[PDB]
Protein backbone atom coordinates (compact mmCIF):
# COMPACT_ATOMS: atom_id res chain seq x y z
CA UNK A 1 0.00 0.00 0.00
CA UNK A 2 1.78 3.11 -1.26
CA UNK A 3 -0.14 5.80 0.62
CA UNK A 4 -0.50 4.02 3.97
CA UNK A 5 3.13 2.86 3.95
CA UNK A 6 4.89 5.20 6.38
CA UNK A 7 8.47 4.08 5.71
CA UNK A 8 8.35 6.03 2.44
CA UNK A 9 8.47 9.75 3.16
CA UNK A 10 5.29 11.62 2.26
CA UNK A 11 6.81 13.72 -0.58
CA UNK A 12 8.11 10.54 -2.23
CA UNK A 13 4.76 8.78 -1.80
CA UNK A 14 2.89 11.44 -3.77
CA UNK A 15 5.53 11.54 -6.51
CA UNK A 16 5.55 7.75 -6.83
CA UNK A 17 1.75 7.68 -6.98
CA UNK A 18 1.62 10.32 -9.72
CA UNK A 19 4.27 8.67 -11.90
CA UNK A 20 3.04 5.11 -11.30
CA UNK A 21 -0.66 5.63 -10.59
CA UNK A 22 -1.37 3.11 -13.36
CA UNK A 23 0.40 0.44 -11.27
CA UNK A 24 -1.77 1.09 -8.18
CA UNK A 25 -4.46 -1.54 -7.71
CA UNK A 26 -8.07 -0.71 -6.87
CA UNK A 27 -7.22 -1.59 -3.26
CA UNK A 28 -4.56 1.15 -3.44
CA UNK A 29 -1.58 -1.22 -3.38
CA UNK A 30 1.31 -0.61 -5.78
CA UNK A 31 1.80 -3.77 -7.86
CA UNK A 32 4.99 -4.32 -9.87
CA UNK A 33 5.87 -7.54 -11.71
CA UNK A 34 8.61 -8.31 -14.24
CA UNK A 35 9.41 -12.05 -14.26
CA UNK A 36 12.34 -11.48 -16.62
CA UNK A 37 14.20 -14.66 -15.65
CA UNK A 38 13.66 -18.33 -14.84
CA UNK A 39 14.95 -17.83 -11.27
CA UNK A 40 12.38 -16.60 -8.75
CA UNK A 41 14.95 -14.72 -6.66
CA UNK A 42 16.23 -12.96 -9.78
CA UNK A 43 12.61 -12.12 -10.57
CA UNK A 44 12.30 -10.91 -6.98
CA UNK A 45 15.68 -9.18 -7.27
CA UNK A 46 14.49 -7.38 -10.40
CA UNK A 47 11.41 -6.33 -8.43
CA UNK A 48 13.64 -5.17 -5.58
CA UNK A 49 15.84 -3.13 -7.91
CA UNK A 50 12.86 -1.32 -9.45
CA UNK A 51 11.63 -0.27 -6.00
CA UNK A 52 15.05 1.19 -5.21
CA UNK A 53 15.01 3.01 -8.55
CA UNK A 54 11.45 4.21 -7.89
CA UNK A 55 12.43 5.42 -4.42
CA UNK A 56 15.52 7.22 -5.71
CA UNK A 57 13.91 8.74 -8.81
CA UNK A 58 10.91 10.01 -6.84
CA UNK A 59 13.17 11.53 -4.18
CA UNK A 60 -4.89 20.60 -15.86
CA UNK A 61 -5.66 20.53 -19.59
CA UNK A 62 -8.30 17.83 -19.11
CA UNK A 63 -10.29 20.00 -16.69
CA UNK A 64 -10.23 23.00 -19.03
CA UNK A 65 -11.60 20.99 -21.97
CA UNK A 66 -14.40 19.62 -19.79
CA UNK A 67 -15.36 23.23 -19.05
CA UNK A 68 -15.22 24.07 -22.77
CA UNK A 69 -17.38 21.11 -23.79
CA UNK A 70 -19.70 21.79 -20.85
CA UNK A 71 -19.93 25.42 -21.98
CA UNK A 72 -20.61 24.18 -25.51
CA UNK A 73 -23.27 21.83 -24.13
CA UNK A 74 -25.01 24.69 -22.30
CA UNK A 75 -25.06 26.82 -25.45
CA UNK A 76 -25.95 23.69 -27.43
CA UNK A 77 -28.73 23.21 -24.83
CA UNK A 78 -31.09 25.78 -26.35
CA UNK A 79 -34.32 24.06 -27.55
CA UNK A 80 -36.88 25.48 -25.11
CA UNK B 1 -2.31 23.54 -71.49
CA UNK B 2 -4.15 20.47 -72.78
CA UNK B 3 -4.14 18.83 -69.35
CA UNK B 4 -6.76 20.24 -67.00
CA UNK B 5 -5.44 21.97 -63.88
CA UNK B 6 -7.60 22.57 -60.83
CA UNK B 7 -7.05 26.16 -59.71
CA UNK B 8 -7.18 25.17 -56.02
CA UNK B 9 -5.65 22.26 -54.13
CA UNK B 10 -8.89 21.43 -52.32
CA UNK B 11 -10.77 20.88 -55.59
CA UNK B 12 -8.31 18.10 -56.44
CA UNK B 13 -8.53 16.89 -52.83
CA UNK B 14 -12.33 16.90 -52.91
CA UNK B 15 -12.33 15.28 -56.35
CA UNK B 16 -9.73 12.75 -55.18
CA UNK B 17 -11.81 12.05 -52.06
CA UNK B 18 -14.88 11.62 -54.26
CA UNK B 19 -12.77 9.46 -56.58
CA UNK B 20 -11.57 7.40 -53.62
CA UNK B 21 -15.17 6.82 -52.52
CA UNK B 22 -16.02 4.97 -55.73
CA UNK B 23 -14.41 1.52 -56.05
CA UNK B 24 -11.48 1.25 -58.43
CA UNK B 25 -9.25 -1.43 -59.90
CA UNK B 26 -6.25 0.13 -58.16
CA UNK B 27 -6.02 -0.42 -54.42
CA UNK B 28 -7.65 2.20 -52.20
CA UNK B 29 -8.25 2.65 -48.49
CA UNK B 30 -12.01 2.11 -48.59
CA UNK B 31 -11.87 -1.36 -50.15
CA UNK B 32 -9.60 -2.72 -47.42
CA UNK B 33 -11.37 -0.90 -44.57
CA UNK B 34 -14.89 -0.73 -46.05
CA UNK B 35 -45.53 23.11 -54.61
CA UNK B 36 -44.28 24.78 -57.79
CA UNK B 37 -46.73 27.64 -57.23
CA UNK B 38 -45.30 28.13 -53.74
CA UNK B 39 -41.79 28.48 -55.17
CA UNK B 40 -42.94 31.12 -57.66
CA UNK B 41 -44.48 33.11 -54.81
CA UNK B 42 -41.27 32.62 -52.83
CA UNK B 43 -39.16 33.85 -55.75
CA UNK B 44 -41.20 37.06 -55.94
CA UNK B 45 -40.24 37.83 -52.34
CA UNK B 46 -36.59 37.09 -53.14
CA UNK B 47 -36.61 39.66 -55.95
CA UNK B 48 -38.13 42.18 -53.53
CA UNK B 49 -35.37 41.44 -51.01
CA UNK B 50 -32.71 41.96 -53.68
CA UNK B 51 -34.39 45.19 -54.81
CA UNK B 52 -34.32 46.57 -51.26
CA UNK B 53 -31.55 49.17 -51.21
CA UNK B 54 -31.18 48.92 -47.42
CA UNK B 55 -30.15 45.27 -47.68
CA UNK B 56 -27.64 46.15 -50.40
CA UNK B 57 -26.25 49.00 -48.27
CA UNK B 58 -25.67 46.64 -45.34
CA UNK B 59 -23.90 44.12 -47.58
CA UNK B 60 -21.42 46.69 -48.89
CA UNK B 61 -21.08 47.96 -45.30
CA UNK B 62 -20.61 44.35 -44.08
CA UNK B 63 -22.97 45.02 -41.16
CA UNK B 64 -25.92 42.81 -42.14
CA UNK B 65 -27.24 40.20 -39.71
CA UNK B 66 -29.81 37.40 -39.73
CA UNK B 67 -32.16 36.14 -36.96
CA UNK B 68 -31.26 32.55 -36.11
CA UNK B 69 -34.62 31.85 -34.45
CA UNK B 70 -36.64 32.77 -37.55
CA UNK B 71 -34.44 30.59 -39.77
CA UNK B 72 -34.65 27.68 -37.33
CA UNK B 73 -38.46 27.51 -37.37
CA UNK B 74 -38.59 27.73 -41.17
CA UNK B 75 -35.88 25.07 -41.59
CA UNK B 76 -37.81 22.56 -39.46
CA UNK B 77 -40.95 23.00 -41.57
CA UNK B 78 -39.21 22.66 -44.94
CA UNK B 79 -36.54 19.95 -44.68
CA UNK B 80 -36.17 19.35 -40.93
CA UNK B 81 -37.66 15.83 -40.86
CA UNK B 82 -35.13 14.59 -43.42
CA UNK B 83 -32.22 15.79 -41.28
CA UNK B 84 -33.96 14.20 -38.30
CA UNK B 85 -33.64 10.77 -39.92
CA UNK B 86 -29.93 11.26 -40.64
CA UNK B 87 -29.06 11.82 -36.98
CA UNK B 88 -31.10 8.81 -35.85
CA UNK B 89 -29.54 6.54 -38.47
CA UNK B 90 -26.04 7.88 -37.80
CA UNK B 91 -26.38 6.99 -34.11
CA UNK B 92 -27.57 3.47 -34.96
CA UNK B 93 -31.04 3.81 -33.45
CA UNK B 94 -32.77 2.22 -36.44
CA UNK B 95 -30.48 -0.82 -36.52
CA UNK B 96 -30.72 -1.32 -32.75
CA UNK B 97 -34.44 -0.59 -32.41
CA UNK B 98 -36.09 -1.96 -35.58
CA UNK B 99 -33.33 -4.36 -36.70
CA UNK B 100 -32.41 -2.18 -39.67
CA UNK B 101 -35.83 -0.85 -40.68
CA UNK B 102 -35.63 2.82 -41.68
CA UNK B 103 -38.48 5.32 -41.40
CA UNK B 104 -38.48 8.99 -42.37
CA UNK B 105 -39.95 10.90 -39.39
CA UNK B 106 -42.93 13.13 -40.14
CA UNK B 107 -44.02 14.47 -36.72
CA UNK B 108 -41.49 17.08 -35.48
CA UNK B 109 -41.12 15.51 -32.05
CA UNK B 110 -39.48 17.68 -29.39
CA UNK B 111 -38.63 16.77 -25.79
CA UNK B 112 -37.17 18.72 -22.88
CA UNK B 113 -36.42 17.82 -19.26
CA UNK B 114 -38.20 20.17 -16.84
CA UNK B 115 -35.73 21.77 -14.41
CA UNK B 116 -38.11 22.34 -11.52
CA UNK B 117 -40.51 24.92 -12.94
CA UNK B 118 -38.28 27.82 -14.05
CA UNK B 119 -36.73 26.16 -17.12
CA UNK B 120 -36.75 22.85 -18.98
CA UNK B 121 -33.59 21.20 -20.35
CA UNK B 122 -33.81 20.60 -24.12
CA UNK B 123 -33.44 17.09 -25.53
CA UNK B 124 -31.81 17.47 -28.95
CA UNK B 125 -30.91 14.68 -31.37
CA UNK B 126 -27.65 13.29 -30.02
CA UNK B 127 -27.88 15.74 -27.12
CA UNK B 128 -25.88 15.52 -23.90
CA UNK B 129 -27.92 15.53 -20.68
CA UNK B 130 -26.53 14.32 -17.37
CA UNK B 131 -28.49 11.74 -15.34
CA UNK B 132 -28.69 14.33 -12.56
CA UNK B 133 -30.67 16.37 -15.11
CA UNK B 134 -32.90 13.33 -15.83
CA UNK B 135 -34.19 12.70 -12.30
CA UNK B 136 -37.67 13.73 -13.53
CA UNK B 137 -39.78 12.68 -16.49
CA UNK B 138 -39.37 15.01 -19.50
CA UNK B 139 -41.99 17.12 -21.26
CA UNK B 140 -42.86 16.03 -24.81
CA UNK B 141 -44.27 18.48 -27.35
CA UNK B 142 -45.27 17.52 -30.89
CA UNK B 143 -54.26 8.11 -31.03
CA UNK B 144 -50.53 7.87 -30.33
CA UNK B 145 -48.08 5.72 -28.37
CA UNK B 146 -45.04 7.23 -26.64
CA UNK B 147 -42.17 4.97 -25.60
CA UNK B 148 -38.84 5.44 -23.81
CA UNK B 149 -35.71 3.29 -24.16
CA UNK B 150 -32.12 3.02 -23.00
CA UNK B 151 -30.61 1.39 -26.08
CA UNK B 152 -27.26 0.56 -24.46
CA UNK B 153 -28.27 1.07 -20.82
CA UNK B 154 -28.86 -2.65 -20.32
CA UNK B 155 -26.31 -4.04 -17.87
CA UNK B 156 -26.47 -7.80 -18.60
CA UNK B 157 -27.68 -8.64 -22.12
CA UNK B 158 -26.59 -6.74 -25.26
CA UNK B 159 -29.80 -7.08 -27.27
CA UNK B 160 -32.11 -6.29 -24.35
CA UNK B 161 -33.09 -2.80 -23.21
CA UNK B 162 -35.09 -1.17 -20.43
CA UNK B 163 -38.11 1.15 -20.56
CA UNK B 164 -38.13 4.40 -18.61
CA UNK B 165 -41.86 5.02 -19.08
CA UNK B 166 -44.32 3.92 -21.76
CA UNK B 167 -47.62 5.64 -22.58
CA UNK B 168 -50.32 4.08 -24.75
CA UNK B 169 -53.46 5.38 -26.46
CA UNK B 170 -52.20 8.98 -26.32
CA UNK B 171 -55.04 11.21 -27.61
CA UNK B 172 -53.78 13.91 -30.03
CA UNK B 173 -51.03 15.99 -28.33
CA UNK B 174 -52.01 15.75 -24.66
CA UNK B 175 -49.95 13.09 -22.88
CA UNK B 176 -51.51 13.13 -19.40
CA UNK B 177 -54.30 10.89 -20.74
CA UNK B 178 -51.91 8.15 -21.86
CA UNK B 179 -52.00 4.94 -19.84
CA UNK B 180 -48.98 4.71 -17.52
CA UNK B 181 -47.97 1.19 -18.51
CA UNK B 182 -44.41 1.68 -17.22
CA UNK B 183 -43.68 4.01 -14.27
CA UNK B 184 -40.91 6.53 -14.75
CA UNK B 185 -37.40 5.53 -13.68
CA UNK B 186 -34.38 7.86 -13.69
CA UNK B 187 -31.51 6.87 -15.99
CA UNK B 188 -29.04 4.37 -14.54
CA UNK B 189 -26.02 4.24 -16.88
CA UNK B 190 -23.12 2.11 -15.66
CA UNK B 191 -19.89 3.90 -14.81
CA UNK B 192 -17.04 3.62 -17.30
CA UNK B 193 -19.39 2.83 -20.20
CA UNK B 194 -19.23 6.37 -21.57
CA UNK B 195 -22.25 7.79 -23.36
CA UNK B 196 -25.53 5.85 -23.47
CA UNK B 197 -28.03 6.77 -26.20
CA UNK B 198 -31.70 6.94 -25.19
CA UNK B 199 -34.27 7.10 -27.99
CA UNK B 200 -37.81 8.47 -27.67
CA UNK B 201 -40.19 6.93 -30.21
CA UNK B 202 -43.59 8.17 -31.42
CA UNK B 203 -45.78 5.72 -33.34
CA UNK B 204 -48.97 6.57 -35.21
CA UNK B 205 -51.93 4.63 -33.78
CA UNK B 206 -54.55 3.72 -36.38
CA UNK B 207 -56.99 2.37 -33.78
CA UNK B 208 -56.91 2.35 -29.96
CA UNK B 209 -55.36 -0.90 -28.74
CA UNK B 210 -55.01 -1.86 -25.08
CA UNK B 211 -51.46 -3.09 -24.48
CA UNK B 212 -52.29 -5.21 -21.45
CA UNK B 213 -49.16 -7.28 -22.13
CA UNK B 214 -47.00 -4.14 -21.96
CA UNK B 215 -48.64 -2.90 -18.75
CA UNK B 216 -46.19 -2.98 -15.85
CA UNK B 217 -46.74 -2.57 -12.10
CA UNK B 218 -46.60 1.00 -10.82
CA UNK B 219 -44.10 1.58 -9.21
CA UNK B 220 -41.74 -1.14 -10.54
CA UNK B 221 -38.10 -1.27 -9.43
CA UNK B 222 -37.13 -4.64 -10.95
CA UNK B 223 -34.76 -4.84 -13.91
CA UNK B 224 -35.82 -8.44 -14.56
CA UNK B 225 -39.26 -7.19 -15.64
CA UNK B 226 -38.02 -3.99 -17.32
CA UNK B 227 -36.00 -5.90 -19.93
CA UNK B 228 -37.69 -5.99 -23.33
CA UNK B 229 -37.08 -5.97 -27.08
CA UNK B 230 -38.26 -3.15 -29.33
CA UNK B 231 -38.25 -5.29 -32.48
CA UNK B 232 -40.60 -8.04 -31.28
CA UNK B 233 -42.80 -5.52 -29.46
CA UNK B 234 -42.94 -3.37 -32.59
CA UNK B 235 -43.56 -6.48 -34.71
CA UNK B 236 -46.49 -7.45 -32.48
CA UNK B 237 -47.94 -3.95 -33.04
CA UNK B 238 -46.42 -3.16 -36.45
CA UNK B 239 -49.88 -3.33 -38.03
CA UNK B 240 -51.17 -0.34 -36.04
CA UNK B 241 -47.80 1.36 -35.34
CA UNK B 242 -45.88 3.46 -37.86
CA UNK B 243 -43.07 5.55 -36.30
CA UNK B 244 -43.04 9.26 -37.10
CA UNK B 245 -41.23 11.07 -34.26
CA UNK B 246 -37.80 10.83 -32.68
CA UNK B 247 -35.71 12.43 -29.94
CA UNK B 248 -32.55 11.04 -28.34
CA UNK B 249 -29.79 12.24 -26.01
CA UNK B 250 -26.54 10.88 -24.58
CA UNK B 251 -25.83 10.68 -20.84
CA UNK B 252 -22.67 9.94 -18.87
CA UNK B 253 -22.29 8.58 -15.36
CA UNK B 254 -23.08 11.04 -12.57
CA UNK B 255 -23.63 11.23 -8.83
CA UNK B 256 -27.39 10.82 -9.26
CA UNK B 257 -26.70 7.48 -10.96
CA UNK B 258 -25.37 6.17 -7.64
CA UNK B 259 -28.61 7.33 -6.01
CA UNK B 260 -30.73 5.65 -8.69
CA UNK B 261 -28.94 2.31 -8.39
CA UNK B 262 -29.13 2.28 -4.58
CA UNK B 263 -32.21 4.20 -3.43
CA UNK B 264 -34.88 2.64 -5.67
CA UNK B 265 -33.14 0.13 -7.95
CA UNK B 266 -31.60 -1.16 -4.69
CA UNK B 267 -28.54 -2.81 -6.21
CA UNK B 268 -24.78 -2.36 -6.40
CA UNK B 269 -23.50 0.30 -8.78
CA UNK B 270 -22.20 -1.40 -11.96
CA UNK B 271 -18.62 -0.50 -12.89
CA UNK B 272 -16.81 -1.44 -16.10
CA UNK B 273 -13.75 -0.35 -18.05
CA UNK B 274 -12.47 -1.38 -21.48
CA UNK B 275 -9.22 -3.36 -21.22
CA UNK B 276 -6.72 -2.76 -24.02
CA UNK B 277 24.95 -24.99 -16.35
CA UNK B 278 24.31 -28.16 -18.37
CA UNK B 279 20.53 -28.27 -17.95
CA UNK B 280 20.10 -24.49 -17.70
CA UNK B 281 22.64 -23.66 -20.42
CA UNK B 282 20.05 -25.06 -22.83
CA UNK B 283 17.44 -22.76 -21.27
CA UNK B 284 19.60 -19.63 -21.18
CA UNK B 285 21.23 -17.96 -24.18
CA UNK B 286 24.69 -19.23 -23.20
CA UNK B 287 25.33 -22.68 -24.68
CA UNK C 1 -30.59 -8.60 -2.14
CA UNK C 2 -31.12 -10.33 -5.48
CA UNK C 3 -31.01 -7.01 -7.35
CA UNK C 4 -27.37 -6.54 -6.29
CA UNK C 5 -26.26 -9.03 -8.96
CA UNK C 6 -24.34 -7.26 -11.73
CA UNK C 7 -22.88 -8.62 -14.96
CA UNK C 8 -19.07 -8.76 -15.26
CA UNK C 9 -18.91 -6.83 -18.56
CA UNK C 10 -21.06 -4.12 -20.11
CA UNK C 11 -22.65 -4.31 -23.57
CA UNK C 12 -22.46 -0.72 -24.79
CA UNK C 13 -23.50 -0.44 -28.45
CA UNK C 14 -23.49 3.32 -29.06
CA UNK C 15 -21.33 4.09 -32.13
CA UNK C 16 -20.08 7.31 -30.51
CA UNK C 17 -19.52 5.81 -27.04
CA UNK C 18 -15.77 5.54 -27.64
CA UNK C 19 -15.67 8.65 -29.85
CA UNK C 20 -17.33 10.83 -27.22
CA UNK C 21 -15.25 9.19 -24.48
CA UNK C 22 -12.14 9.85 -26.58
CA UNK C 23 -11.03 6.20 -26.75
CA UNK C 24 -12.20 5.68 -30.35
CA UNK C 25 -9.53 5.11 -32.97
CA UNK C 26 -8.43 8.04 -35.12
CA UNK C 27 -7.15 7.51 -38.66
CA UNK C 28 -3.36 7.25 -38.30
CA UNK C 29 -2.69 6.16 -41.90
CA UNK C 30 -2.18 8.17 -45.07
CA UNK C 31 1.36 9.00 -43.96
CA UNK C 32 2.22 9.63 -47.63
CA UNK C 33 -0.63 12.15 -48.05
CA UNK C 34 -1.42 15.56 -46.56
CA UNK C 35 -3.11 16.63 -44.28
CA UNK C 36 -3.41 14.51 -41.13
CA UNK C 37 -6.41 12.20 -40.69
CA UNK C 38 -6.43 12.38 -36.86
CA UNK C 39 -9.90 13.94 -36.74
CA UNK C 40 -13.26 12.35 -35.99
CA UNK C 41 -15.15 15.20 -37.68
CA UNK C 42 -14.08 17.82 -40.22
CA UNK C 43 -15.60 21.06 -41.48
CA UNK C 44 -15.98 21.16 -45.27
CA UNK C 45 -16.66 24.67 -46.59
CA UNK C 46 -17.63 24.87 -50.27
CA UNK C 47 -18.25 28.26 -51.90
CA UNK C 48 -20.13 27.88 -55.18
CA UNK C 49 -20.52 30.66 -57.73
CA UNK C 50 -23.91 31.72 -56.34
CA UNK C 51 -24.08 29.90 -52.98
CA UNK C 52 -21.89 29.22 -49.94
CA UNK C 53 -22.17 25.85 -48.18
CA UNK C 54 -20.49 24.46 -45.06
CA UNK C 55 -20.63 20.81 -43.99
CA UNK C 56 -19.36 18.76 -41.05
CA UNK C 57 -18.32 15.24 -42.07
CA UNK C 58 -17.34 12.31 -39.86
CA UNK C 59 -14.49 9.94 -40.72
CA UNK C 60 -17.04 7.49 -42.16
CA UNK C 61 -17.88 10.08 -44.83
CA UNK C 62 -21.44 10.80 -43.66
CA UNK C 63 -22.22 14.48 -43.13
CA UNK C 64 -23.97 14.89 -39.79
CA UNK C 65 -24.36 18.69 -39.87
CA UNK C 66 -25.00 20.33 -43.25
CA UNK C 67 -25.44 24.10 -43.59
CA UNK C 68 -26.31 25.54 -47.00
CA UNK C 69 -27.50 28.98 -48.07
CA UNK C 70 -29.65 27.38 -50.77
CA UNK C 71 -31.89 26.20 -47.92
CA UNK C 72 -35.08 28.26 -47.94
CA UNK C 73 -35.10 29.32 -44.28
CA UNK C 74 -31.69 31.02 -44.29
CA UNK C 75 -31.83 32.63 -47.73
CA UNK C 76 -35.17 34.39 -47.25
CA UNK C 77 -33.53 36.26 -44.35
CA UNK C 78 -30.17 36.47 -46.19
CA UNK C 79 -29.67 39.27 -48.71
CA UNK C 80 -27.08 37.67 -51.02
CA UNK C 81 -26.05 34.02 -50.91
CA UNK C 82 -22.47 35.02 -51.81
CA UNK C 83 -21.12 37.54 -49.30
CA UNK C 84 -18.82 37.90 -46.31
CA UNK C 85 -21.87 38.22 -44.05
CA UNK C 86 -23.27 35.08 -45.68
CA UNK C 87 -20.17 33.22 -44.50
CA UNK C 88 -20.77 34.65 -41.03
CA UNK C 89 -24.46 33.74 -41.19
CA UNK C 90 -23.81 30.22 -42.50
CA UNK C 91 -21.23 29.80 -39.75
CA UNK C 92 -23.80 30.78 -37.14
CA UNK C 93 -26.40 28.67 -38.95
CA UNK C 94 -23.89 25.83 -39.20
CA UNK C 95 -23.18 26.33 -35.51
CA UNK C 96 -26.91 26.27 -34.77
CA UNK C 97 -27.18 23.10 -36.85
CA UNK C 98 -24.11 21.87 -34.97
CA UNK C 99 -26.02 22.83 -31.84
CA UNK C 100 -28.97 20.89 -33.24
CA UNK C 101 -26.93 17.76 -33.99
CA UNK C 102 -25.19 17.63 -30.61
CA UNK C 103 -21.69 17.82 -32.11
CA UNK C 104 -19.43 20.24 -30.22
CA UNK C 105 -15.98 19.42 -31.67
CA UNK C 106 -14.67 19.45 -35.23
CA UNK C 107 -11.34 19.81 -37.05
CA UNK C 108 -11.03 22.60 -39.62
CA UNK C 109 -8.14 22.67 -42.12
CA UNK C 110 -8.40 25.90 -44.13
CA UNK C 111 -6.17 26.43 -47.15
CA UNK C 112 -3.63 29.27 -47.32
CA UNK C 113 -5.91 31.34 -49.57
CA UNK C 114 -9.08 30.19 -47.80
CA UNK C 115 -7.53 30.97 -44.42
CA UNK C 116 -6.61 34.46 -45.63
CA UNK C 117 -10.22 35.05 -46.70
CA UNK C 118 -11.87 37.50 -44.32
CA UNK C 119 -15.25 35.82 -44.85
CA UNK C 120 -13.90 32.47 -43.65
CA UNK C 121 -12.16 34.18 -40.74
CA UNK C 122 -15.44 35.82 -39.76
CA UNK C 123 -17.15 32.47 -40.26
CA UNK C 124 -14.63 30.98 -37.83
CA UNK C 125 -15.32 33.92 -35.52
CA UNK C 126 -19.00 32.99 -35.74
CA UNK C 127 -18.13 29.37 -34.92
CA UNK C 128 -15.92 30.12 -31.91
CA UNK C 129 -18.45 32.50 -30.32
CA UNK C 130 -21.17 29.89 -30.87
CA UNK C 131 -18.93 27.42 -29.02
CA UNK C 132 -18.19 25.08 -31.92
CA UNK C 133 -14.53 24.12 -31.48
CA UNK C 134 -12.26 24.14 -34.53
CA UNK C 135 -9.97 21.66 -32.72
CA UNK C 136 -11.13 18.19 -31.69
CA UNK C 137 -10.04 16.35 -28.54
CA UNK C 138 -7.00 14.12 -28.78
CA UNK C 139 -7.56 10.38 -28.85
CA UNK C 140 -7.00 8.36 -25.67
CA UNK C 141 -4.50 5.51 -25.94
UniProtKB/Swiss-Prot annotation, chain A:
Cellular location(s): Mitochondrion
Domain of life, source organism: Eukaryota
Modification after translation, per record: Methylation of glutamine in the GGQ triplet by HEMK1.
Function of the molecule: Essential peptidyl-tRNA hydrolase component of the mitochondrial large ribosomal subunit. Acts as a codon-independent translation release factor that has lost all stop codon specificity and directs the termination of translation in mitochondrion, possibly in case of abortive elongation. May be involved in the hydrolysis of peptidyl-tRNAs that have been prematurely terminated and thus in the recycling of stalled mitochondrial ribosomes.
Quaternary structure note: Component of the mitochondrial ribosome large subunit (39S) which comprises a 16S rRNA and about 50 distinct proteins.
Family: Belongs to the prokaryotic/mitochondrial release factor family. Mitochondrion-specific ribosomal protein mL62 subfamily.
Protein name, per record: Large ribosomal subunit protein mL62
Shown segment, full-protein numbering: 104 to 192 of 206
From Swiss-Prot, chain B:
A GO biological-process term: mitochondrial translation
Organism: Mus musculus
Localization in the cell: Mitochondrion
Main localization category: mitochondrion
Recorded coiled-coil stretches: 36-59
Entries under Pfam families matching the protein: PBP
Family (UniProt): Belongs to the phosphatidylethanolamine-binding protein family. Mitochondrion-specific ribosomal protein mL38 subfamily.
Name assigned to this protein: Large ribosomal subunit protein mL38
Cellular component, GO, one term: mitochondrial ribosome
Disulfide cross-links: none
Record's keyword terms, sorted: Coiled coil, Mitochondrion, Ribonucleoprotein, Ribosomal protein, Transit peptide
Subunit structure: Component of the mitochondrial ribosome large subunit (39S) which comprises a 16S rRNA and about 50 distinct proteins.
Superkingdom, taxonomy of origin: Eukaryota
UniProtKB/Swiss-Prot annotation, chain C:
Source taxonomy: Eukaryota, Metazoa, Chordata, Craniata, Vertebrata
Keyword Ribonucleoprotein: yes
Record-level GO BP terms: mitochondrial translation; rRNA import into mitochondrion
The family this protein is said to belong to: Belongs to the universal ribosomal protein uL18 family.
GO CC annotations on file: mitochondrial inner membrane; mitochondrial large ribosomal subunit; mitochondrion
This protein's UniProt keywords: Chaperone, Mitochondrion, Ribonucleoprotein, Ribosomal protein, RNA-binding, Transit peptide, Transport
Record carries keyword Electron transport: no
GO molecular function: 5S rRNA binding; structural constituent of ribosome
Assembly mode: Component of the mitochondrial ribosome large subunit (39S) which comprises a 16S rRNA and about 50 distinct proteins.
Major localization class: mitochondrion
Protein location: Mitochondrion
Protein name stated in the entry: Large ribosomal subunit protein uL18m
Described purpose of this protein according to its UniProt entry: Together with thiosulfate sulfurtransferase (TST), acts as a mitochondrial import factor for the cytosolic 5S rRNA. The precursor form shows RNA chaperone activity; is able to fold the 5S rRNA into an import-competent conformation that is recognized by rhodanese (TST). Both the cytoplasmic and mitochondrial forms are able to bind to the helix IV-loop D in the gamma domain of the 5S rRNA.
Amino acid sequence: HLASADWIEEPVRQKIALTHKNKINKAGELVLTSESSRYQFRNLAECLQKIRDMIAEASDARLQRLRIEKMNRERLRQKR
Amino acid sequence: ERLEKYRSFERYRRRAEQEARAPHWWRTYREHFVRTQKLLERKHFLRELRANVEEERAARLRTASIPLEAVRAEWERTCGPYHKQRLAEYYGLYRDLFHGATFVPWVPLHVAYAVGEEDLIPVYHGNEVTPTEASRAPEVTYLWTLLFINLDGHLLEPDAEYVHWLLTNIPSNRVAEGQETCPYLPPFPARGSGFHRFAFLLFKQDKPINFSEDTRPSPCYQLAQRTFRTFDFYKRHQEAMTPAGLAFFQCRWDDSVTHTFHQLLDMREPVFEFVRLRYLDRYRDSH
Amino acid sequence: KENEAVAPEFTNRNPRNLELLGVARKERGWATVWPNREFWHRLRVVKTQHHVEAFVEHLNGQVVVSASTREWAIKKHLYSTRNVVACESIGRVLAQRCLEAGINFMVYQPTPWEASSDSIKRLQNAMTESGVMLREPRRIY
